[PDB]
């Protein structure tokens, strides 16, 4: 079980060819990600399979939650509508999130922004959760930037980021 196989973190829809992207959190920009009192990095396990091959950060107690991803719009399939997702999980101990929803944001090269909010206190703990950060049309150039943010004046813990996903909405 030793030979390694390196592969691009992407997929193509079979019938129509559109490209989707997965971004693992080691390739995101995690503010304080190198500080174990802020984020502590874990191996993601599924007991019946073994390691899933993803190092995931768990929030350990910081007031400043800021995670950014980015992708070249021109690297995706032209003319399609795309959706940006963040796959997350909450786990005990959870703290600091009451009335401070996690903010998800997509910003486009024209400067426009879409923000969603997720109340972490209402999520079932341990479940992998698909959250929608926003939508964009694959036209033009530049980078789409997709973030999760909570910077209120309160220590937070218990959030795990599994990955970000940029997926096409094909016919």
């Amino acid at each position: 079980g030793q030979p390694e196989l390196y592969a691009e973190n992407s997929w193509r829809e079979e019938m129509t060819g559109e490209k989707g992207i997965l971004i693992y959190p080691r390739e995101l920009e995690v503010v304080g990600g190198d500080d174990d009192s802020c984020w502590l990095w874990h191996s993601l396990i599924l007991e019946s399979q073994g390691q899933l091959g993803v190092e995931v950060p768990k929030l350990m107690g910081t007031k400043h939650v800021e995670v950014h991803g980015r992708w070249k719009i021109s690297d995706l399939t032209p003319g399609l509508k795309y959706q940006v997702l963040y796959m997350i999980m909450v786990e005990d101990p959870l703290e600091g999130w009451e009335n401070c929803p996690l903010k998800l944001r997509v910003t486009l090269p024209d400067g426009s922004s879409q923000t969603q909010q997720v109340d972490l206190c209402k999520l079932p703990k341990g479940q992998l959760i698909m959250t929608v950060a926003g939508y964009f049309d694959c036209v033009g150039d530049g980078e789409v930037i997709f973030s999760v943010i909570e910077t209120s004046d309160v220590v937070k813990k218990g959030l795990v980021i599994k990955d970000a996903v940029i997926r096409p909405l094909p016919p």
């Binding site: 592969a7 691009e8 079979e14 019938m15 990095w41 396990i45 999980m89 997926r167």
Partner: protein, 171 residues
């Protein structure tokens, strides 16, 4: 060695509770996968920094390709429309696919069966494809099974399985 985050092989959409599920290759039934010759287990490495692998099988040379899996309807969202997929990759150096299509079947609890033949020469090389096993609307109970099979005389090479998934239609 990293601390662990344990998962279940399902996910749920934050916005409405809709559920998906998936199975990784050690949870699939792959004929002869441990024979040391037909398939070889690789460490499948996605990402470029902080890389961990997942154990995944690569087809090394056999005439007998038989991949099967099953899912519980009760783990899905009743009434929701699903797409069943196999995330797989045709690799550089593949052989035998010119005259041997994969026969794909998705079997639903109501006794119905969806069949198709997949021409792997039309897949891109060295990128994962979401191969479509079928489409259905979930009900309360029952077993979903699928098979991807070819046992023809042609010696087949160069095919990696990542996972099988039942996902809500992307929207």
């Amino acid at each position: 060695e990293l601390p662990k985050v344990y998962t279940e092989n399902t996910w749920m959409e934050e916005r409405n509770g809709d559920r998906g599920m998936l199975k990784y290759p050690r949870e699939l039934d792959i004929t002869n996968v441990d024979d040391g010759k037909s398939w070889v287990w690789h460490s499948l490495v996605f990402g470029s920094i902080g890389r961990l692998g997942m154990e995944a099988p690569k087809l090394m040379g056999t005439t007998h390709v038989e991949i099967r899996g099953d899912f519980k309807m009760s783990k899905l969202t009743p009434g929701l429309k699903y797409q069943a997929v196999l995330l797989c990759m045709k690799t550089d150096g593949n052989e035998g696919w010119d005259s041997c299509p994969l026969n794909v079947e998705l079997n639903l609890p109501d006794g119905t069966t969806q069949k198709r033949e997949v021409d792997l020469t039309k897949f891109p090389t060295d990128e994962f494809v979401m191969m479509v096993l079928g489409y259905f609307e979930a009900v309360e109970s029952g077993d979903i099974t699928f098979s991807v099979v070819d046992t023809s005389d042609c010696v087949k090479k160069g095919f990696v399985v990542k996972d099988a998934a039942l996902r809500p239609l992307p929207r």
